[PDB]
Amino acid sequence: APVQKQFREFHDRIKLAQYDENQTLRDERDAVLTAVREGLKKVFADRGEAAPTFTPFNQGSYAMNTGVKPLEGGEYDIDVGIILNIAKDDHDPVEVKKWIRDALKDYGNGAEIRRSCVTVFKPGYHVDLAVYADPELSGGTLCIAKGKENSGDEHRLWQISDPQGFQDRIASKLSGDDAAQFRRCIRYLKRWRDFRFSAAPLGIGLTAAAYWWFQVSKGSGYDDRDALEQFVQTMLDNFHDGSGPRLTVELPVQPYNDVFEKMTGMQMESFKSKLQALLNALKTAKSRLELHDACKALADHFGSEFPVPEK
Numbered sequence: 001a002p003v004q005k006q007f008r009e010f011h012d013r014i015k016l017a018q019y020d021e022n023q024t025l026r027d028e029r030d031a032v033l034t035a036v037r038e039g040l041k042k043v044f045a046d047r048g049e050a051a052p053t054f055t056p057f058n059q060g061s062y063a064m065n066t067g068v069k070p071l072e073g074g075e076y077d078i079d080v081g082i083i084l085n086i087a088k089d090d091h092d093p094v095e096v097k098k099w100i101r102d103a104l105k106d107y108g109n110g111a112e113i114r115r116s117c118v119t120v121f122k123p124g125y126h127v128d129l130a131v132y133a134d135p136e137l138s139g140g141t142l143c144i145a146k147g148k149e150n151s152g153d154e155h156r157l158w159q160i161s162d163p164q165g166f167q168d169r170i171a172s173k174l175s176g177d178d179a180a181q182f183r184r185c186i187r188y189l190k191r192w193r194d195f196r197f198s199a200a201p202l203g204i205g206l207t208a209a210a211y212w213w214f215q216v217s218k219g220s221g222y223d224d225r226d227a228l229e230q231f232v233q234t235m236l237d238n239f240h241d242g243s244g245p246r247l248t249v250e251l252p253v254q255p256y257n258d259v260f261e262k263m264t265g266m267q268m269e270s271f272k273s274k275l276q277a278l279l280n281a282l283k284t285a286k287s288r289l290e291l292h293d294a295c296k297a298l299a300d301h302f303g304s305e306f307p308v309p310e311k
């Protein structure tokens, strides 16, 4: 059955406005940044040292306009980059993340140092602060602080990064109504992720996969069901058998890492099976005569906000 109207209704329910269109997200972002700015002055004052400063930039889905609302009991995810005014060769990357952790000591319940960011957890959302060294002071590269406290020397590094280049690639892939379909299809699959996975890499992973493999589908209108079917099939086509089935997807800018690499062999096998089931549901929605049956098939994978008309 034709299901484009219901996909567009679903899109309206799941979409979360980007930073430039969302005063609440800007305010919450700016609240944590001020907490970092004020905290650094105190931490360093208390050591009788000059505080480092930083330049923030928007990152992640709320920067790229690929954001979704969480399900009840899920969290918003505010991604921000902070570029510290330091030479990467003067500081251990873990020690620079400790500055940020210490700055936020007294903010909500404080912050957690993770492999790739410093996270502040609040009721119903967290703020992931990616921590970078200054490119000019560091020899011209923008490097992110990798590693956890008490991590071995091999598991901490200043890793070459290109967050602006990634955002530019996502923004420039398509334009106008074609780009709108691309963003809708990323959002649909994020809600699928949230509904069908009890999964952290799937956000970036699905976005990078869409960059490589998304194709517009339009005739008498945009055909989101068909664009998803082609995209899901293409993702499945790109699994390879190592030990078991894996999908390896390079980031399309430095450092060209596999954005799915954190997933275990079993998580990848489960991922593939859930993509197969989604593909069948997309095919079923096309072939079903009754709109009710087509939409029920989709709601089984996209969840309760996918509208299922009566009859």
Ligand SMILES: Nc1ncnc2c1ncn2[C@@H]1O[C@H](COP(=O)(O)OP(=O)(O)OP(=O)(O)O)[C@@H](O)[C@H]1O
Pocket: 060, 079, 113, 114, 115, 116, 117, 128, 130, 144, 161, 262
């Ligand atoms: N290369 C990256 N650039 C920017 N931000 C990143 C990068 N990798 C991860 N992040 C951010 O860090 C968050 C958490 O990923 P991270 O790798 O730090 O997890 P973790 O909790 O330490 O687990 P693990 O150590 O097993 O990977 C992501 O949601 C994202 O916002």
Ligand SMILES: Nc1ncnc2c1ncn2[C@@H]1O[C@H](COP(=O)(O)OP(=O)(O)OP(=O)(O)O)[C@@H](O)[C@H]1O
Pocket: 059, 060, 061, 062, 066, 067, 068, 077, 079, 128, 163, 166, 190, 200, 201, 202, 203, 204, 207, 251, 257, 258, 259, 260
């Ligand atoms: N594994 C990774 N490799 C490279 N860059 C990463 C990785 N994980 C995160 N990032 C970077 O950090 C940003 C924020 O990470 P996060 O996992 O929150 O994804 P996202 O694009 O914001 O999607 P979501 O809607 O799921 O939060 C990504 O958009 C990307 O720029």
Ligand SMILES: [Mg+2]
Pocket: 060, 061, 062, 077, 078, 079, 203
């Ligand atoms: Mg995010």
Ligand SMILES: [Mg+2]
Pocket: 060, 077, 078, 079, 128
């Ligand atoms: Mg995040």
